[PDB]
Every structure is written in structure tokens, then in C-alpha cells.
Amino acid sequence: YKIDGNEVIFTLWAPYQKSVKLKVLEKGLYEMERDEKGYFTITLNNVKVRDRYKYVLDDASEIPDPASRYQPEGVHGPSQIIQESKEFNNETFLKKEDLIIYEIHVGTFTPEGTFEGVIRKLDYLKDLGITAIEIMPIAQFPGKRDWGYDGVYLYAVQNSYGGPEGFRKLVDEAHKKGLGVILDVVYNHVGPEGNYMVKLGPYFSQKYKTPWGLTFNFDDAESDEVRKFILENVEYWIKEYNVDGFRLDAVHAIIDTSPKHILEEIADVVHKYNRIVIAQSDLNDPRVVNPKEKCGYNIDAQWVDDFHHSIHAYLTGERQGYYTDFGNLDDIVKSYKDVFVYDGKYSNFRRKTHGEPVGELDGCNFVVYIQNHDQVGNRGKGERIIKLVDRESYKIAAALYLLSPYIPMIFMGEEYGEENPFYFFSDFSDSKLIQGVREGRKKENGQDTDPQDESTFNASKLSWKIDEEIFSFYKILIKMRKELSIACDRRVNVVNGENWLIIKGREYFSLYVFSKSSIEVKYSGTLLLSSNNSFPQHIEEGKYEFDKGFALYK
């Protein structure tokens, strides 16, 4: 819908449909006008905020507005008219160079499990030193318990998180404290329950498919209209919620043979309105992130799993699944200096040459992390990294990524040493999709807890039980990162021995000692932070025997 004066126009794209009725609960049932492209319209003046509606089909069946701005009673319920309060700054205050990201899943972040709860932690976040929070998909999904990837109404803010007014409030309040909100949005597929679009027109592709559901149609017959639906969604989050930016989910699953790729156009929209886009890409292809004049889509930054895997594999000894491609110290140094470990070499996991070099792009085209919703949640037993390594090792990990040239991302809970798992959970009601997610989860991941069990979700709620030592260490890591100008700067000299490595920047050097070992230190510096009490205040060039631990010098 659109609010013009006293009156509101309803627009529904539905080429498969012969005629559609607008049905406003308590008001009437109105026949809509059809243009030759398959759009049905009607201008109404008896309509006010909070009115509810559905569309009734050829079928006589009723369905919610797929473009709904609010789904008060979940995915099968009526759509409802929201206040179009359309103030948005023309510019985000977030500077990409300065970005430190905090990943949040509203549902489990906080005893409340709502936006209100996240507002309550804003001081904490601000003080920690984070500059922007990334919110996992809030697009209306079935039930109350879901990561968000089963979202099925791209424009509706999940009822149970506190709806539109809550999300709006969360972003006004984070702006008030000087933090940005980044929104995780899903354009690659659509959840299995509560999707009605199939009945309306070719929203989805015959050609291609994703593991998680039906993919959008961007390049076959009738795709102008769907390109539009997605592009207007990024416009909408910006204007109607004043979001600062986006993390785009699984971009490698957004397939488009059009003359200009839909991803280049998404970036275009966000840049038109001066915002930030991060892509999750498994492609290891600089094309996602390269400028247009270099044939790229010009997305601002992309997740680099190779950094995370390097660290995790090495430190944990783990080799299941994608970890088989990793394990050596080498892999960490590689990712530390060429960004991608798979930059065009053979992957035994994938059984093909994977990736491409990234060139001279600086570090702030990439985001790195030792934890996140996937790298915890996709483990059968949801274990956080903190269960898989010792204490020294955990802090060494935090240092490796927060002191890296790349944009770092903390996974809610990581900073204070959360020990509770993060499981896959879902809340479908359809007994065939309940049966399907359980059997799927059991076999891709070896997940023994039931995703549809409420306890599984509860187990995943952050404890807020603070480990002051770990928390303090993060606080300083973040501070020192800013003071030392580490951000984006790829000019780092890295030496390694069997069980240690030293990384040296323009302003600093770090000691990463994985086992007691004897090291030649080529620099002089004074100590900024350390994982132990065993490193000197001031060190000089010379050879030293260190115990497992990390240290930072200037």
C-alpha cells in the first residue's frame, strides 16, 4: 500500500490471477482493477491505521498481503496498516573504516527476547566499544522461535520481537547512543511456511534452487516485477526504519544472468541513500566487492570464512566438513596477508579450484570473526568456540581477529565468555515441515536436540554470566585497535615458527604463542595488553622463551 492523502492505494502484483478482491476486515470486500502486466489496484478512503486486510483470489481463498508491512497474528494471519512515518537521515554517521560489529539474535539475546531487550543493552554495547549492531532477520517468520532465515514476509517486522514500533524504537535509541543498526536481509530464498506468492505469479525460478527453499526469479519471464519487489525492500528498510545498512544473506545463492546483476543494483540503492552493504559470500570472488570500473558489484565488504576457519581448524584440531580444507598455521598467515586462503587453489572439500586473489583492496572490504550464528549454530551440538579450546587459546583467537586489518564481528555473548550453546531452532506448525526440518537437521549437522523443541531455544538464550577477565580483555582489544589505527591497514609483516607467530603493523606488534617456545623478537615496544602476567612492560630486540599466551606492544 501507499498513503497519498486521506486515501490509500492498494497494489498487488498477481499475473496468475483473473480477479482479486480486497477484503478489509470489518469494512467490506472491494473488487480491484487489473492492468495488462498483472497488477491489481484500488484507491480507498475509508481506511485508517491499524485496519486489517487480506486479498481474496480467483480461488475464493484468502491470503495476506505478500508486501505486508505487519503481520499481527503471524504468517497465516491478516495483514495490518502501519504508520508510514517516513523520516530518515540522508546519511548514516557510521564510517566503514571504523566499523566494529555486534551480531544479535533478538529472540535469545536477552530474557525479554524483544527489541525492548536489546535497547536495554545499548549502554553495555556502547561501553564495550562496538560501533554497530547487526540484527538477524526480522522479516516475519512462522511462530516465535527461528534464526530468521525462514522469514516469509520481506516487509513485515516480526510480531513477536515487538513489531514495527519496537524496531523503529530500537533504531532511534541506538542512534541516540551513537550506535548503528545493520539489518540481515534475505533475498536468496523464502521460508517454507506461510508463503503465498506461488499462487500469484512467477516470483520464483524454474531454473535454479537453494537448499533452504524456493529462490527468487531475477532473469526469466516476468522478473521486472520481482527485481522491483526486492529493490524496493532495500529502499523501504532505509526510508521507513532509518536502518544504517545491510548484511545480505548467502549472495552466492542469488543467481542472475541479467546484463546488470541484481546485487549490483542492490548496492546501487543503498549507496543512492548513502548507506552500507555487507555481503555474505561463499564465492571467494573479489567481484562482489570490487568497484564497478573494476567489474564488480561494489558491495562495501563481504564475510571471509577463510579467516575464521583458519583459526578454528588450527586451534581446535577439528577437520569435519569444511575444516578439512584447513588446519595449518600457514593457513592463518595466508588469510592474514592475502585475505582468502582459497584464492584460486584446489579444495578437497569442494573438489574443484576455488576462489580468486583479492588484489590491492584494503582490509575494510572484509569482515572476520571467530564466532557467529552459523559457526556456532550449524554444529550439531551448538558448541561455542570457548568449549573447544583452552582459555589462553580463546584469548589468542579474540586477539587474532580484533587486531586484524579487517572489520571484526563479535557474536553476542562471546565478549564475556558465554558458555551456553546456540542451537538451530524453528517454530513451524505444519507437521510435514516439522518432520522435514528435524530429519534435515539430524543429517546435515548431526543435531540431536530437536529444533522444534522450546527447550532448544531456551538453552540458547544468553546467560549474561560475566567472566570479568575475558570481558575486560575484549574491552581493551577493541580500544587498542582504534588507538593503533589497525583498521583496514593490510601492510603487516608476519613471521611464524612451529608453534608461534608475530604480527607487526605500522604501530604495533603482537606475539601469538601457541606452545611454550623460544622466539627471536625483532622489535622494541611497550606492553599494551597481554593474556598473562608473564610478558614484560617493555621488551627489546632479542630472543625470549615464552609460555602459551598473547601480548601486544607499541
Ligand X SMILES: OC[C@H]1O[C@H](O[C@H]2[C@H](O)[C@@H](O)[C@@H](O[C@H]3[C@H](O)[C@@H](O)[C@@H](O[C@H]4[C@H](O)[C@@H](O)[C@@H](O[C@@H]5[C@@H](O)[C@@H](O)O[C@H](CO)[C@H]5O)O[C@@H]4CO)O[C@@H]3CO)O[C@@H]2CO)[C@H](O)[C@@H](O)[C@@H]1O
**Residues engaged in binding ligand X (CB under 6 A):** 147, 149-150, 186, 192, 211-213, 249-250, 280, 282, 373-374, 378, 424, 426, 436-437, 440-441, 444
- Minimum distance from residue 194 beta carbon to ligand X (Å): 12
Of residues 225 and 374, the one with the C-beta less far from ligand X:
374
- Minimum distance from residue 243 beta carbon to ligand X (Å): 18
Of residues 222 and 282, the one with the C-beta less far from ligand X:
282
How far apart, in Å, are the Cα atoms of 119 and each of 106, 139, 312, 411?
10, 19, 32, 17
Contact between residue 427 and residue 452 where contact means Cβ atoms under 8 Å apart: yes
Of residues 249 and 450, the one with the C-beta less far from ligand X:
249
- Minimum distance from residue 186 beta carbon to ligand X (Å): 6
Of residues 129 and 213, the one with the C-beta less far from ligand X:
213
Of residues 277 and 488, the one with the C-beta less far from ligand X:
277
Place of cell 544479535: 104
What type of residue sits at position 139? A
Nearest to 457 by CA among 180, 149, 194, 113: 113
Contact between residue 105 and residue 136 where contact means Cβ atoms under 8 Å apart: yes
Residue nearest to ligand X according to CB distances in the complex: 440
Nearest to 467 by CA among 415, 401, 528: 415
Distance between CA 318 and CA 379 in Å, rounded? 12
What type of residue sits at position 496? N
Of residues 147 and 204, the one with the C-beta less far from ligand X:
147
- Minimum distance from residue 374 beta carbon to ligand X (Å): 5
Nearest to 136 by CA among 168, 171, 107: 107
Go through 247-283 and write b for each residue having 16 or more CB atoms within 10 A of its CB, e for each that does not.
Answer: bbbbbebbbbeeeebbbbbbbbbbeebebbbbbbbbe
How far apart, in Å, are the Cα atoms of 342 and each of 309, 310, 326, 346, 394?
11, 11, 10, 8, 25
- Minimum distance from residue 436 beta carbon to ligand X (Å): 5
- Cell of residue 43, nine digits: 484507491
- Minimum distance from residue 137 beta carbon to ligand X (Å): 8
- Minimum distance from residue 38 beta carbon to ligand X (Å): 25
Of residues 250 and 487, the one with the C-beta less far from ligand X:
250
Nearest to 539 by CA among 517, 508, 515: 508
Nearest to 9 by CA among 22, 19, 20, 18: 22
- Minimum distance from residue 251 beta carbon to ligand X (Å): 8
- Cell of residue 154, nine digits: 520481506
Distance between CA 215 and CA 219 in Å, rounded? 12
Of residues 129 and 286, the one with the C-beta less far from ligand X:
286
- Minimum distance from residue 268 beta carbon to ligand X (Å): 22
What type of residue sits at position 193? E
Distance between CA 397 and CA 400 in Å, rounded? 5
Of residues 369 and 546, the one with the C-beta less far from ligand X:
369
Distance between CA 69 and CA 54 in Å, rounded? 12
Nearest to 399 by CA among 280, 325, 286, 486: 486
Of residues 194 and 286, the one with the C-beta less far from ligand X:
194
- Minimum distance from residue 151 beta carbon to ligand X (Å): 9
Of residues 368 and 501, the one with the C-beta less far from ligand X:
368
Distance between CA 344 and CA 355 in Å, rounded? 4
- Minimum distance from residue 129 beta carbon to ligand X (Å): 25
Of residues 229 and 473, the one with the C-beta less far from ligand X:
229
Distance between CA 339 and CA 323 in Å, rounded? 17
Q: Which helix (H) or strand (E) holds 163?
A: helix 163-176
- Minimum distance from residue 400 beta carbon to ligand X (Å): 22
Place of cell 554497530: 132
Place of cell 527476547: 113
- Minimum distance from residue 62 beta carbon to ligand X (Å): 23
Of residues 25 and 198, the one with the C-beta less far from ligand X:
198
Go through 514-551 and write b for each residue having 16 or more CB atoms within 10 A of its CB, e for each that does not.
Answer: beeeebebeeebeebbbbeeebeeebeeeeeebebbbb
Distance between CA 8 and CA 48 in Å, rounded? 9
